[PDB]
Design a protein around this ligand. Structure first.
Ligand SMILES: *[C@@H]1O[C@H](CO)[C@@H](O[C@@H]2O[C@H](CO)[C@@H](O)[C@H](O)[C@H]2NC(C)=O)[C@H](O)[C@H]1NC(C)=O
Ligand code: NAG
Ligand code: NAG
Ligand code: CA
Lengths: 230, 127, 115
């Protein structure tokens, strides 16, 4: 059973914390039963969702526990007590919010695609560089001209430790777009979702004219400077 | 002695005036006008819309900067009355203002919720 | 031409464009009402090109050492057609008409917010 804790994206956007314990590489076994428990004798809510059998001679199942937010930041060692007779181990996998991490805000920089890629004319690549977040749970989401993009057009990397700050983690979100889309404006906005952020959301934008441009078309008009000023 | 003529923090123009005490005779003292204008090279046309195109033309009507459309009080013999200080008025905002925090709302989707959350276009402005 | 004589300075309040005839013009310096012997205001006479709109003057005769040091002389004018009923124009040497504009259009990439 994989131990997947619900990230901050679930508890912020979905307004609900679904404690999932997904079984992996389970050879097919009838009557799969999943329950949910705490470190102590109290039991959090058992699973209500079940999944159909996988066609590759395997069985799929996803547990759930619609616990509140404030006891998700309690920090107790919640365990998914999977009732199984084929395996005598209950597979009580532990997932909780770690209290020891001290919050740090992620700053997003939007690197425009390099000229060595735009000259190749195949496809531009804008990357959102999310650096310096300690809770290791960033939800980097990508839009286009104010309209959100598909979740498969961009790949957000797993968070990795920063080179200099050891307690801060960084992520790399990369979006591949066609080359004529970048040269026709169409401002791409990278938005992140994170705990240490003030409004939980930070947005940066680039386009052809913003990110590392080869032209600055500034036309200052200081009109009426000899006319009236108190 | 740089008296602050305007301190417009929305177009970043600062105009200051002084009498340079240049010579002994009190007439040729030059009335010096210090227009200091910060041009944001990367701010968009609409600052509150971060998806707006890049602001290229920066027009600064200096009479529009120097208007004083806050009525002031004057003390008459029998009355105190609000007094208009200009005939001009009856806002592009090339730059953000430090005191004012600007928020834009983004569509954030996870499972099709589209929870519209406000960002902070200027961080460290309302924190 | 008048300040070169270094004797007196005449500041003119050009109240023009008022079609009701009666107008009240008083000068103040630093928020205190100046004496009525300091300034003399004309009777309203019709504006030439305008049909029935009037114009009026107010000549404040101050010494030149007051005006060249940069003292604010405010023209308080009261009329019925004004929205707040009183307009205050102020003039002094520092506002004036400048004789040396020094402009600095600092085109900075990382301006963003003003400071
Ligand atoms: C600048 O951008 C802001 C934010 O996108 C615009 O404000 C919105 O305008 C739409 C359409 O007028 C309204 O439906 C929203 O209610 C507005 N939101 C807010 C928070 O004001 C604003 O109109 C834009 N201004 C210009 C001149 O383009
Ligand atoms: C530069 O700005 C002027 C301002 O009117 C505009 O007409 C022109 O098209 C602009 N050129 C580019 C390349 O942005
Ligand atoms: C105008 O000149 C003064 C020197 O008297 C200088 O200090 C000031 O910086 C100048 N104004 C601007 C806007 O640079
Ligand atoms: Ca404020």
């Amino acid at each position: 059973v994989f131990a997947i804790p619900p990230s901050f994206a679930s508890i912020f956007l979905t307004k609900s914390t679904k404690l999932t314990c997904l079984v992996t590489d389970l050879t097919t076994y009838d009557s799969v039963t999943i329950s949910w428990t705490r470190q102590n004798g109290e039991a959090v809510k058992t699973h209500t969702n079940i999944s159909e059998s996988h066609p590759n001679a395997t069985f799929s199942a996803v547990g759930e526990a619609s616990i509140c937010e404030d006891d998700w930041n309690s920090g107790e060692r919640f365990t998914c007590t999977v009732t199984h007779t084929d395996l005598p181990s209950p597979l009580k996998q532990t997932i909780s919010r770690p209290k020891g991490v001290a919050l740090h805000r992620p700053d997003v920089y939007l690197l425009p695609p390099a000229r060595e890629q735009l000259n190749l004319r195949e496809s531009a690549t804008i990357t959102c560089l999310v650096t310096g977040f300690s809770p290791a749970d960033v939800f980097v989401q990508w839009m286009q001209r104010g309209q959100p993009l598909s979740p498969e057009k961009y790949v957000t990397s797993a968070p990795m430790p920063e080179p200099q700050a050891p307690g801060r983690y960084f992520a790399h979100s990369i979006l591949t777009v066609s080359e004529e889309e970048w040269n026709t404006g169409e401002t791409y906005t990278c938005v992140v979702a994170h705990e240490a952020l003030p409004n939980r959301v930070t947005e940066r934008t680039v386009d052809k004219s913003t990110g590392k441009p080869t032209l600055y078309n500034v036309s200052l008009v200081m009109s009426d400077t000899a006319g009236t000023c108190y | 002695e740089r008296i602050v003529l305007v301190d417009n923090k929305c177009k970043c123009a600062r105009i200051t005036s002084r009498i340079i005490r240049s010579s002994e005779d009190p007439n040729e003292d030059i009335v010096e006008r210090n227009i200091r204008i910060i041009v944001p090279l990367n701010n968009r046309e609409n600052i509150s819309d971060p998806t707006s195109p890049l602001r290229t033309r920066f027009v600064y009507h200096l009479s529009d900067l120097c208007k004083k459309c806050d009525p002031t009080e004057v003390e008459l013999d029998n009355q105190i009355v609000t007094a208009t200080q200009s005939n001009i008025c009856d806002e592009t905002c090339y730059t953000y203002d430090r005191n004012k925090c600007y928020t834009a709302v983004v569509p954030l989707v996870y499972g099709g919720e589209t929870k519209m959350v406000e960002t902070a276009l200027t961080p460290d402005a309302c924190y």
